[PDB]
């Protein structure tokens, strides 16, 4: 709930941009990728 | 029943692409691949976390990949039939 | 070798020789199964696929076992119980052996996989 | 290898409960069920949408249901061995 207002499609482009290893963004994976985007940005 | 439907439910899916699944045409396949669903097992994964629910899966395929009613109907039917035979 | 098996109908792939001399199929049901034009698909690692086809008319009776021998085993073909695959010396060896039973319409109805 | 692992990887899972999955003890299984992961196939589904990735699956399992290193190692290894055989 830190990367809210961002669509699943924008979260994906952001995973790609930061070279974060990922699969699709779906309901059961959303929180995990938001945490990985946070861990990345905060380093 | 179609050729694509018959060939998909006849055997384990293994490493088959998204396009091998019934209802997944050129457009719908290109969009699923753009969302990260390169393989048909990734779509089966979504279907399994959605607990094989028809309404939740078909509304998901529509919302995220722009699937029409015929496409979502055909994709769900193939996965349901496949899970009943191989899972 | 770790063993993994799936049976959708009456006929199971009961036993797979790790030395490749045979494949045994068992009718685990109390009913007779028509197996005419059925096929055994054998996949050893990355080797070419091996396909054995059953005769156009064949019946595996309730609770019976049929063994499909590779030519190398020196088995005698006695149709009901024992089938000899004359043109193929081995079922194949390796670290991953997948034996699938396919029905007359091309559906995988059974399998046994040996790993390591 | 444990008995739980051996029974799980030997055959199709169908609608077996989550607890049938190796590494899934009483507490872990309870925590997964309350999160909607009541059957082993729902967890297999998660493993598939994560593209069978070890790091991603083990991290999700630790974050969702408090799985320890040994539990997530065993749940992953059981699902990987199962998917290599039956998918």
Numbering used by the authors:
A (entry chain G): 2 to 44
B (entry chain E), D (entry chain D): 3 to 89
C (entry chain B): 430 to 545
Give the original sentences from the paper that presented this experimental model.
One of the best-studied LEM-domain proteins is emerin, a ubiquitously-expressed integral protein anchored at the nuclear membrane. It consists of 254 amino acids including an N-terminal LEM-domain, a large intrinsically disordered region (IDR) and a short transmembrane segment. The emerin LEM-domain binds to the highly conserved DNA-binding protein barrier-to-autointegration factor (BAF, also known as Banf1). Finally, BAF is able to mediate interaction between emerin and the lamin A/C tail.
Interestingly, missense mutations (P22L, T43I) and a small deletion (ΔK37) associated with exclusive cardiac defects were detected in emerin LEM-domain that interacts with the DNA binding protein BAF. Indeed, this emerin LEM-domain directly interacts with the barrier-to-autointegration factor (BAF), an 89-residue protein that binds to double-stranded DNA. Analysis of the 3D structure of the LEM-BAF complex reveals that emerin Pro22 and Lys37 belonged to a well-conserved surface that is involved in BAF binding (in blue on Figure 3a). By contrast, Thr43 mutation was located on the opposite side of the LEM-domain, far from the interface with BAF. Only a few signals corresponding to the residues close to the site of mutation are shifted, demonstrating that the mutations P22L and T43I do not modify the 3D structure of the emerin construct EmN. Finally, we tried to crystallize the ternary complexes formed by the EmN mutants, BAF and the Igfold domain of lamin A/C using the same protocol used for wild-type EmN. We succeeded in solving the 3D structure of the complex containing EmN T43I at a resolution of 2.3 Å. The structure of the mutated LEM-domain bound to the BAF dimer is displayed on Figure 3c. Analysis of the crystal structure of EmN T43I bound to BAF corroborated that this mutation does not perturb the interface with BAF.
